[PDB]
Design an enzyme around this catalytic site. Structure first.
Site, short mmCIF file in Angstrom:
data_model
loop_
_atom_site.label_atom_id
_atom_site.label_comp_id
_atom_site.label_asym_id
_atom_site.label_seq_id
_atom_site.Cartn_x
_atom_site.Cartn_y
_atom_site.Cartn_z
N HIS A 1 0.35 -0.51 -3.77
CA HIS A 1 1.79 -0.42 -3.61
C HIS A 1 2.29 -1.71 -2.95
O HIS A 1 1.80 -2.11 -1.89
CB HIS A 1 2.10 0.79 -2.72
N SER B 1 10.02 -0.60 -3.18
CA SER B 1 9.84 0.57 -2.35
C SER B 1 11.18 0.99 -1.75
O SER B 1 12.11 1.29 -2.49
CB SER B 1 8.82 0.26 -1.26
N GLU C 1 -0.15 3.39 -6.71
CA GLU C 1 0.86 3.45 -5.66
C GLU C 1 0.44 4.16 -4.38
O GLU C 1 0.82 3.73 -3.28
CB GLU C 1 2.14 4.10 -6.19
C1 LIG Z 1 -0.08 4.36 13.14
C2 LIG Z 1 1.46 4.54 12.82
C3 LIG Z 1 1.89 5.73 11.92
C4 LIG Z 1 2.15 7.07 12.47
C5 LIG Z 1 2.52 8.10 11.52
N1 LIG Z 1 2.68 8.02 10.20
C6 LIG Z 1 2.45 6.72 9.62
C7 LIG Z 1 2.64 6.70 8.13
C8 LIG Z 1 2.40 5.45 7.55
C9 LIG Z 1 1.98 4.18 8.30
O1 LIG Z 1 1.77 2.99 7.54
C10 LIG Z 1 2.18 2.77 6.16
O2 LIG Z 1 2.90 3.54 5.65
N2 LIG Z 1 1.69 1.64 5.58
C11 LIG Z 1 2.25 0.57 6.39
C12 LIG Z 1 3.40 -0.01 5.54
C13 LIG Z 1 2.90 -0.52 4.20
N3 LIG Z 1 4.08 -1.03 3.34
C14 LIG Z 1 4.60 -2.35 3.83
C15 LIG Z 1 5.81 -2.91 3.02
C16 LIG Z 1 5.73 -2.62 1.44
C17 LIG Z 1 4.96 -1.32 1.04
C18 LIG Z 1 3.68 -1.22 1.81
C19 LIG Z 1 2.07 0.60 3.44
C20 LIG Z 1 0.89 1.11 4.41
C21 LIG Z 1 1.81 4.23 9.71
C22 LIG Z 1 2.03 5.51 10.45
C23 LIG Z 1 2.70 9.31 12.21
C24 LIG Z 1 3.05 10.55 11.76
C25 LIG Z 1 3.18 11.68 12.72
C26 LIG Z 1 2.94 11.49 14.11
C27 LIG Z 1 2.56 10.14 14.68
O3 LIG Z 1 2.33 9.85 15.88
N4 LIG Z 1 2.46 9.07 13.62
C28 LIG Z 1 2.09 7.65 13.89
C29 LIG Z 1 3.07 12.66 15.13
O4 LIG Z 1 3.45 13.96 14.53
C30 LIG Z 1 3.70 14.28 13.21
O5 LIG Z 1 4.00 15.44 12.92
C31 LIG Z 1 3.57 13.11 12.13
O6 LIG Z 1 4.87 13.04 11.51
C32 LIG Z 1 2.68 13.42 10.92
C33 LIG Z 1 1.27 13.59 11.17
#
Ligand SMILES: CCc1c2c(nc3ccc(OC(=O)N4CCC(N5CCCCC5)CC4)cc13)-c1cc3c(c(=O)n1C2)COC(=O)[C@]3(O)CC
Ligand SMILES: CCc1c2c(nc3ccc(OC(=O)N4CCC(N5CCCCC5)CC4)cc13)-c1cc3c(c(=O)n1C2)COC(=O)[C@]3(O)CC
Ligand SMILES: *[C@@H]1O[C@H](CO)[C@@H](O)[C@H](O[C@H]2O[C@@H](C)[C@@H](O)[C@@H](O)[C@@H]2O)[C@H]1NC(C)=O
Ligand SMILES: *[C@@H]1O[C@H](CO)[C@@H](O)[C@H](O[C@H]2O[C@@H](C)[C@@H](O)[C@@H](O)[C@@H]2O)[C@H]1NC(C)=O
Ligand SMILES: *[C@H]1O[C@H](CO)[C@@H](O)[C@H](O[C@H]2O[C@@H](C)[C@@H](O)[C@@H](O)[C@@H]2O)[C@H]1NC(C)=O
Ligand SMILES: *[C@H]1O[C@H](CO)[C@@H](O)[C@H](O[C@H]2O[C@@H](C)[C@@H](O)[C@@H](O)[C@@H]2O)[C@H]1NC(C)=O
Ligand SMILES: *[C@@H]1O[C@H](CO)[C@@H](O)[C@H](O)[C@H]1NC(C)=O
Ligand SMILES: *[C@@H]1O[C@H](CO)[C@@H](O)[C@H](O)[C@H]1NC(C)=O
EC number: 3.1.1.7
Lengths: 533, 533
Positions: free
Chosen positions: A437, A197, A324
């Site tokens: 993934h 990744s 993925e």
């Molecule tokens: C709850 C936390 C969290 C938040 C956001 N996006 C997340 C994307 C992905 C994960 O988890 C994984 O990817 N994963 C966790 C990581 C995992 N990996 C680990 C290592 C190897 C690959 C797999 C895959 C699943 C957690 C997220 C987010 C977006 C936005 C906010 C906001 O408050 N948050 C909080 C405010 O306003 C915006 O306009 C905005 O940008 C868009 C709406």
């Protein structure tokens, strides 16, 4: 005292560790840079000042300050990626796994953890290098680098927060490995950097970056590509987010200097708490602080560098996993659940399409929708779900990697493409999530070898095969046995574009990986969005 | 003297004709309008001045002035569509086929020949109505209308060349049938107008036009729709081509009056020789002088009329053929031949795409290409060829008809959809051409009934079935047997959108005819071209 090693920075005390009813050496916590603390926060890393005495490298180091996933508390599935040590800015250390007896001038393999550039740790269980180093008799190294604002805040122009520092952290570790790995039986002229990744994208960025090329021999890329939609931003967007972060923390904005001072006083958690607030869109698979196209670490635009062939030319082994996108939909799309087969409705489908392709205009969204909708049965809960999985997959990992593959193979020296599509027998996630993934990693590091991890016999074979391919490749530049009778993993060529799948069944060769959908993502849609905007 | 009929315009002398070892009456050449000659050229038709004595209607009338296809001289395949009589502006006549003994108040069926609005004849062998009228005991009528500049030159504003006159010609024949068909045993309150290709589009235009609705009961549409890309132009384009024609003939252009005078002196062949020179593009399936959206014959835009339901509401039976596009590719695309399987190359494919979608911008062309290209095997000569066939088919006939179907069925009273996919056993064209545009006609008129035409036994059944569906429908508004045990031809509904195929095998029911490709042609591409231009 093979455990007592003397490096060009000081001495280090190792520790013997058991592995499959045997032992090997292990030096955990070797520091390769001055702690990026205080005024160092955001600055390029500085080499570690030589120390006196014996540095104890028996335990694992600290983890870098990061966002911790707590969406599914007390669930190994997601917790296996969280920091398993004490988070701290002082986190620039690396771990080595030397076989015993300590060989000399043997193949070295440096692992670069993934995590979207906002998270990651070199100390996870799933990244324990003792099995690979042991079974394949190699010097396995696992580095670390700054993430989030700490590792990629970018105020292009400043020298205080130039951006890409996190990548520079990786470079300095590679440099260290370069100058000191020989003292551990490693062969600096035979180093293979590999990662998944964000880690994979990292490898690719080191291939491109003129200042990293000479630090390694060959490379491996797992479900990650330097040209991924989420792997970088322009200097402008980088500066926009940096400012936004400051605004998000009530900071003086008038100038870089004032903003840097403000962000340098805030405690690590303060920055982290408002980290997601800087993204330009509502979306999934998008990360706040990533590599920035600066004109320095990256000479010119990624695409131009790939066309002109301006990048390190060697052998590369890379590939992807069948599903993925599933992991990200679960966390961000409407309708997805861990406690059901997540049959997605037509309305939620339309919603997921938007979150998946945030930069798209309305016509773009239509394009994507039409491409992935079967109008002979568009209310099919299953279909819509798998459709999103593919969209998220193809757009963020598979097609970007395929573009990279094709572009690289024109100047490369050897390309090996794999398609990991094996669903672990003991996977803790539900079935709809398929081959998630990052779940090929446990096989790369050979956990199916641990009898206590209740895998199948067939799965121990796969893990041993996979490690062998990975090991043999890093050693020769070819994963195939010099002359075995086992099916050969063909070489990916521009004409035949062959690749193989990775699973328990007998090997099979295919061609043009998701070629159809990739023409859509790599050529058409980019054009459509350009013309109509 | 059932052969001596008295109409509100004068008396007419018929003639007995043999049909499948028996006879029926036939009145060929009945005039229903004053000859559109001299200053009448281009003007709306004027009703036929009542005549004195007995009009001899024993032979077929003249054919209207038209472009004659001579691309394959001495080949029945294409010659069967050419004028088989002496061409002449004085061509506004109609033919009737009355069963014997002359019944009374029986189902009437008026045929409107196709030919892209630039050609056609009511006297072709393939349109001999004696079999249908005989076998199904109905009063089969075949009208005629002006074509080419003669029938559709449009200088909107003028009263001399208002446009759509050709359609008005059809209206006046329908009016005649209205007032006189009863004198032939026909029931004016039970008339079904049917036609193929341009003829089909014609039927649809009569359904829409407020001034034609009351002239018929139900309608049938074969491989043609009023909203087809080629079936009409805007008042502006209509005026552009008219001028262009004039320029093409060295005419005073300064004003409508001067231009009309010039075109009215030129001999018919002069106009015809430069007729193709007015099209805006290099292309296939595009015709110079067609119906014009005038605000009169057509109240408002076709699409608006369909949305508002502003159109005659009755029962309709319509459908298409499997390979609608093949016929046109043979005549206009690069690479196609009658003497080979026409395996198309990638370069010729790209060329055909342009000719097939002339109005498309570069991005549009990409869209079309991506949609119909299989990148897993894009050099497959066969595939590319079939790909073009489908493109030409879907864009010009199938999807336009499907849009019409869906739109109509919301206010309609009964919709029956068929998919003719039977390849005649004795077809003179090569095999790659499949089920060619217009080759369902020979079955509708029942030529497979003529033993001397060397068809198969199974094909005589089909022709008898097809005629029965067509006859029964025109008689009841439903093609199914009131209560037979034979498989029913379901009713096309907005929800289930069912249809059946037409061939020798046992009936089968399907749903959403080419729904996937039609979403592309009806929704997406139109939007793409709108946004990016
Ligand atoms: C709850 C936390 C969290 C938040 C956001 N996006 C997340 C994307 C992905 C994960 O988890 C994984 O990817 N994963 C966790 C990581 C995992 N990996 C680990 C290592 C190897 C690959 C797999 C895959 C699943 C957690 C997220 C987010 C977006 C936005 C906010 C906001 O408050 N948050 C909080 C405010 O306003 C915006 O306009 C905005 O940008 C868009 C709406
Ligand atoms: C050789 C005559 C001929 C010409 C053109 N197009 C034709 C289209 C189709 C047929 O035949 C059938 O459709 N078919 C014949 C009709 C047949 N029907 C019969 C009745 C029922 C359906 C099947 C189907 C096959 C014959 C054509 C044409 C086009 C243009 C010219 C130009 O000189 N020509 C000459 C100059 O400049 C331009 O820019 C351009 O517009 C575009 C390049
Ligand atoms: C360093 O080596 C020590 C042996 O000389 C060993 O005892 C340390 O183990 C742990 O000790 C405890 C008291 C604590 O310091 C803990 O952090 C150590 O892991 C070992 N670890 C150190 C101190 O780096
Ligand atoms: C009209 O009926 C005539 C019998 O009264 C018949 O002879 C005509 O047949 C053909 O005759 C020749 C001489 C020629 O006029 C030809 O056009 C006729 O078809 C028949 N046809 C006519 C004259 O309309
Ligand atoms: C196989 O190893 C697993 C490691 O995660 C373990 O969870 C399974 O359970 C057993 O071992 C330990 C961990 C404990 O849970 C014990 O109660 C179980 O017997 C183990 N498979 C089994 C069921 O033996
Ligand atoms: C079946 O009818 C066909 C009508 O087109 C005909 O061409 C076939 O040929 C025979 O009949 C006539 C037309 C002539 O060509 C004669 O020499 C042929 O025997 C006919 N099928 C056959 C071969 O009998
Ligand atoms: C790599 O380079 C070697 C020698 O420079 C050459 O023999 C080989 O063909 C190259 N590998 C490929 C297949 O690109
Ligand atoms: C046609 O109209 C009749 C009565 O007006 C109605 O009973 C019938 O349902 C209609 N046909 C359909 C199925 O639309």
């Amino acid at each position: 005292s093979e455990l007592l090693v003397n490096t060009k920075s000081g001495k280090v005390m190792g520790t013997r560790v058991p592995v499959l009813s045997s032992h090997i050496s292990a030096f955990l916590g070797i520091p390769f840079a001055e702690p990026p603390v205080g005024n160092m926060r955001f600055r390029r890393p500085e080499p570690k000042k030589p120390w006196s005495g014996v540095w104890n490298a028996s335990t694992y180091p600290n983890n870098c300050q990061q966002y911790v996933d707590e969406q599914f508390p007390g669930f190994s599935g997601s917790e296996m990626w969280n920091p398993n040590r004490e988070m701290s800015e002082d986190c620039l250390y690396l771990n080595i796994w030397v076989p015993s007896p300590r060989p000399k001038s043997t193949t070295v393999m440096v692992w670069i953890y993934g995590g979207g550039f906002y998270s990651g740790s070199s100390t996870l269980d799933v990244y324990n290098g003792k099995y690979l180093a042991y079974t394949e008799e190699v010097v396995l190294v696992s580095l670390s680098y700054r993430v989030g604002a700490f590792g990629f805040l970018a105020l292009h122009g400043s020298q205080e927060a130039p951006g890409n520092v996190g990548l520079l952290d990786q470079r300095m570790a590679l440099q260290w490995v370069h100058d000191n790995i020989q003292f551990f039986g490693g062969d600096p002229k035979t180093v293979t950097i590999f990662g998944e990744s964000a880690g994979g994208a990292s490898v690719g960025m080191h291939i491109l970056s003129p200042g990293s090329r000479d630090l390694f021999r060959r490379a491996i890329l797992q479900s990650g590509s330097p040209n991924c939609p989420w792997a970088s931003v322009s200097v402008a967007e980088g500066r926009r987010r940096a400012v936004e972060l400051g605004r998000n923390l009530n900071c003086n904005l008038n100038s870089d200097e004032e903003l840097i001072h403000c962000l340098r006083e805030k405690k690590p958690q303060e920055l982290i708490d408002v980290e997601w607030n800087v993204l330009p869109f509502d979306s999934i698979f998008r990360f706040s602080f990533v590599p920035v196209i600066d004109g320095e670490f990256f000479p010119t635009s990624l695409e131009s560098m790939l066309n002109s062939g301006n990048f390190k030319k060697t052998q590369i082994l890379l590939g992807v996993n069948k599903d993925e996108g599933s992991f990200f939909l679960l966390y961000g799309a409407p309708g997805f659940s861990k406690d059901s087969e997540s049959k997605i409705s037509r309305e939620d489908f339309m919603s997921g399409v938007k979150l998946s392709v945030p930069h798209a205009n309305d016509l773009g969204l239509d394009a994507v929708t039409l491409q992935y909708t079967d109008w002979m049965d568009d209310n099919n809960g299953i279909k819509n779900r798998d459709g999103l999985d593919d969209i998220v997959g193809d757009h963020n990992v598979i097609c970007p990697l395929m573009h990279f593959v094709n572009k690289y193979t024109k100047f490369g020296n050897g390309t090996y493409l794999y398609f990991f599509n094996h669903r672990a027998s003991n996977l803790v996630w539900p079935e709809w999530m398929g081959v998630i993934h990052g779940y090929e990693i446990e096989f790369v590091f050979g956990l199916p070898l641990v009898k206590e991890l209740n895998y199948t016999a067939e799965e121990e074979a796969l893990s041993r095969r996979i490690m062998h391919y990975w090991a043999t490749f890093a050693k020769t530049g070819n994963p195939n046995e010099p002359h075995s009778q086992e099916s050969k993993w063909p070489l990916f060529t521009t004409k035949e574009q062959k690749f193989i799948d990775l699973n328990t069944e007998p090997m099979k060769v295919h061609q043009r990986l998701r070629v159809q959908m990739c023409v859509f993502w790599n050529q058409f849609l980019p054009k459509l969005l350009n013309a109509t905007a």
